[PDB]
Design an enzyme around this catalytic site. Structure first.
Site, mmCIF file in Angstrom:
data_model
loop_
_atom_site.group_PDB
_atom_site.id
_atom_site.type_symbol
_atom_site.label_atom_id
_atom_site.label_comp_id
_atom_site.label_asym_id
_atom_site.label_seq_id
_atom_site.Cartn_x
_atom_site.Cartn_y
_atom_site.Cartn_z
ATOM 1 N N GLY C 9 0.837 -1.177 0.000
ATOM 2 C CA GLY C 9 0.000 0.000 0.000
ATOM 3 C C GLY C 9 0.877 1.234 0.000
ATOM 4 O O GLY C 9 2.106 1.148 0.012
ATOM 5 N N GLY C 10 0.217 2.384 -0.013
ATOM 6 C CA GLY C 10 0.930 3.640 -0.079
ATOM 7 C C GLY C 10 1.442 4.105 1.273
ATOM 8 O O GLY C 10 1.371 3.412 2.289
ATOM 9 N N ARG C 12 1.308 5.845 4.659
ATOM 10 C CA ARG C 12 0.243 5.952 5.659
ATOM 11 C C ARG C 12 -1.061 5.335 5.157
ATOM 12 O O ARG C 12 -2.114 5.973 5.116
ATOM 13 C CB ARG C 12 0.033 7.406 6.089
ATOM 14 C CG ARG C 12 1.151 7.946 6.957
ATOM 15 C CD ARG C 12 1.338 7.091 8.198
ATOM 16 N NE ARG C 12 2.544 7.460 8.927
ATOM 17 C CZ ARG C 12 3.694 6.804 8.854
ATOM 18 N NH1 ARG C 12 3.814 5.697 8.137
ATOM 19 N NH2 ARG C 12 4.750 7.269 9.514
ATOM 20 N N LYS C 15 -0.703 -0.273 6.345
ATOM 21 C CA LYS C 15 -0.213 -1.590 5.967
ATOM 22 C C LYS C 15 0.572 -2.247 7.096
ATOM 23 O O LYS C 15 0.470 -3.464 7.287
ATOM 24 C CB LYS C 15 0.620 -1.499 4.680
ATOM 25 C CG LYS C 15 1.821 -0.581 4.719
ATOM 26 C CD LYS C 15 2.452 -0.477 3.326
ATOM 27 C CE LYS C 15 3.650 0.453 3.325
ATOM 28 N NZ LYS C 15 3.306 1.777 3.880
ATOM 29 N N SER C 16 1.324 -1.468 7.880
ATOM 30 C CA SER C 16 2.065 -2.052 8.998
ATOM 31 C C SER C 16 1.116 -2.595 10.060
ATOM 32 O O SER C 16 1.304 -3.706 10.567
ATOM 33 C CB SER C 16 3.014 -1.021 9.604
ATOM 34 O OG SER C 16 4.031 -0.678 8.679
ATOM 35 N N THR C 35 14.410 -4.078 8.435
ATOM 36 C CA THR C 35 15.432 -3.793 7.437
ATOM 37 C C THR C 35 15.893 -2.340 7.430
ATOM 38 O O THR C 35 16.837 -2.018 6.701
ATOM 39 C CB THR C 35 14.931 -4.163 6.036
ATOM 40 O OG1 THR C 35 13.768 -3.386 5.724
ATOM 41 C CG2 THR C 35 14.574 -5.629 5.969
ATOM 42 N N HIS C 52 8.117 2.264 17.520
ATOM 43 C CA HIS C 52 7.785 0.914 17.070
ATOM 44 C C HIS C 52 8.255 -0.132 18.073
ATOM 45 O O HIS C 52 7.506 -1.049 18.433
ATOM 46 C CB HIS C 52 8.413 0.648 15.701
ATOM 47 C CG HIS C 52 7.573 1.098 14.546
ATOM 48 N ND1 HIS C 52 6.432 0.432 14.153
ATOM 49 C CD2 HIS C 52 7.720 2.132 13.686
ATOM 50 C CE1 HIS C 52 5.905 1.045 13.108
ATOM 51 N NE2 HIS C 52 6.667 2.082 12.805
ATOM 52 N N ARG C 55 6.137 -0.113 21.328
ATOM 53 C CA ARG C 55 4.808 -0.709 21.220
ATOM 54 C C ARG C 55 4.836 -2.206 20.932
ATOM 55 O O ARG C 55 3.785 -2.852 21.004
ATOM 56 C CB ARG C 55 4.003 -0.014 20.125
ATOM 57 C CG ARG C 55 3.915 1.493 20.258
ATOM 58 C CD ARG C 55 3.035 2.050 19.153
ATOM 59 N NE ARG C 55 3.014 1.155 18.001
ATOM 60 C CZ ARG C 55 3.830 1.249 16.960
ATOM 61 N NH1 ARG C 55 4.733 2.213 16.873
ATOM 62 N NH2 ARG C 55 3.737 0.352 15.980
ATOM 63 N N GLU C 64 17.475 -7.275 13.303
ATOM 64 C CA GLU C 64 17.760 -6.129 12.448
ATOM 65 C C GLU C 64 18.762 -6.556 11.385
ATOM 66 O O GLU C 64 19.935 -6.785 11.686
ATOM 67 C CB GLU C 64 18.289 -4.960 13.271
ATOM 68 C CG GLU C 64 17.330 -4.507 14.355
ATOM 69 C CD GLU C 64 17.866 -3.341 15.162
ATOM 70 O OE1 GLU C 64 19.056 -3.372 15.539
ATOM 71 O OE2 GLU C 64 17.097 -2.391 15.414
#
Lengths: 185, 185, 185
Positions: C9-10, C12, C15-16, C35, C52, C55, C64
């Site tokens: 998706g674009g 905002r 999608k996350s 990544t 991130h 949360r 990572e």
């Protein structure tokens, strides 16, 4: 059984491959109508175009017309000699129309000329004895507000796609190589 | 029967026409809430806005409020005098909010103000005796990473669209003038 | 029951969040493969990354690896210790691959390296004892024709997304936080 199909999507969205599959569904002998001009020097599309031609099935016919596309296809007489047509592509037809104008920063002449091209294509496809699939781009879902020529191009291509999608019997929107059905009778 | 509908899409995607069709489905008397400001000089939206007003049905009412939209609509009392509402548009509401800030390169004040506008609209629509259709833009599917103000705008508009789409009863995503149903109860 | 899911998706577009919901559906113990590199100075992603991490559920593991992702995940042995994997994200994997090249204006080395990364991931996911969800971006639906590096990035990311979507069992395209099903077995 779709007489007119529009396939649109973003950069590297699989739209050419999908349109070519649809066209192969028409029959063995396809007319490939190519609207890109191959320039000399930097920024030339020569390499991509040559590889496209190399991979093209040997029974297909190629007609190169960057402008006045309906006129050129119709007067070639090839619609009576093939099983179907693929138009590649509306994006470059729109660019060719924009840069043929005296002042690309003036929206009205470009828009009128592009709508004329699109209406001539609609009329030809309505009369065509064989089905067509047309490839076009979605360019309106980012932020391109920097210069007048780019804004005008985005508006005009959006209008062209609206006209074609309204006339088309089937419309597909490509996402990462996969089709989403937008319209199907 | 949809109380709140969100219609979004790219540049020249047919989203205004589709939203206006939905609104006409509400009844004869529609409140058109216009968030664009008409500037003097170059880059003015005056011509497009005038043609919009000329084509508007004569029984519709027009309220021009570029900011504090829920407040202005609510205090006008017009929700009790119409059959439904069309908000045109969230894209310009977001732009108006961005450029009202002291420093458009600072994300936080802009984002907080835009979310306040969106939550006030959600609250008003929840209380509204008539249905609403809202028009917004998709701008996040290109590459706009050049300057901080454009990145911030894209983020904030994306968040606004997420909030509205979550509250909306129906959500449509326009592709070349045709709706894709994203959400429908 | 989907072994491999692609969520794109674009900017905002939710999608996350949607991918994380899918991953939580896998089980309590998820491997988050990140990544993005956190740079020092201006333009750093440090703030977003820290929030991130704050949360993130406490039973999840974080790996990572900005490059050679399949190699790093496989040699960590963590696939045998978790319930599923979320890869965040292909957009930054592609950027890391582009800027690791000697000349970002040369398309071929970048494209070959990115396809190698993608094929290694496909192979690892095929062998994986646990399901994966991968997050990627749509960037091809605007107008980004200004510089060669941006055009190359858009092409390469489009190709990566095509490869992943072809291998994936399910593919979702996010619009304003809501999923459109593009592919589902």
């Amino acid at each position: 059984g779709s007489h007119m199909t529009l396939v649109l999507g973003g950069i590297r969205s699989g739209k050419s491959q999908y349109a070519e599959q649809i066209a192969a569904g028409f029959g063995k002998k396809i007319l490939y109508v190519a609207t890109a001009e191959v320039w000399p020097g930097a920024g030339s599309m020569e390499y991509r175009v040559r590889k496209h031609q190399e991979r093209r099935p040997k029974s297909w016919l190629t007609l190169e017309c960057p402008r006045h596309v309906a006129s050129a296809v119709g007067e070639s007489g090839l619609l009576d000699q093939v099983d179907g047509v693929i138009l590649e592509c509306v994006t470059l037809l729109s660019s060719n129309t924009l840069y043929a104008q005296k002042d690309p920063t003036d929206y009205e002449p470009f828009q009128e000329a592009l709508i004329e091209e699109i209406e001539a294509l609609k009329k030809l496809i309505r009369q065509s004895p064989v089905p067509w699939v047309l490839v076009s781009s979605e360019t309106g879902m980012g932020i391109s507000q920097s210069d007048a020529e780019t804004r005008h191009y985005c508006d005009g291509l959006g209008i062209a796609n609206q006209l074609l999608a309204k006339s088309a019997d089937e419309v597909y929107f490509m996402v990462a190589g996969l089709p989403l059905t937008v319209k199907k009778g």
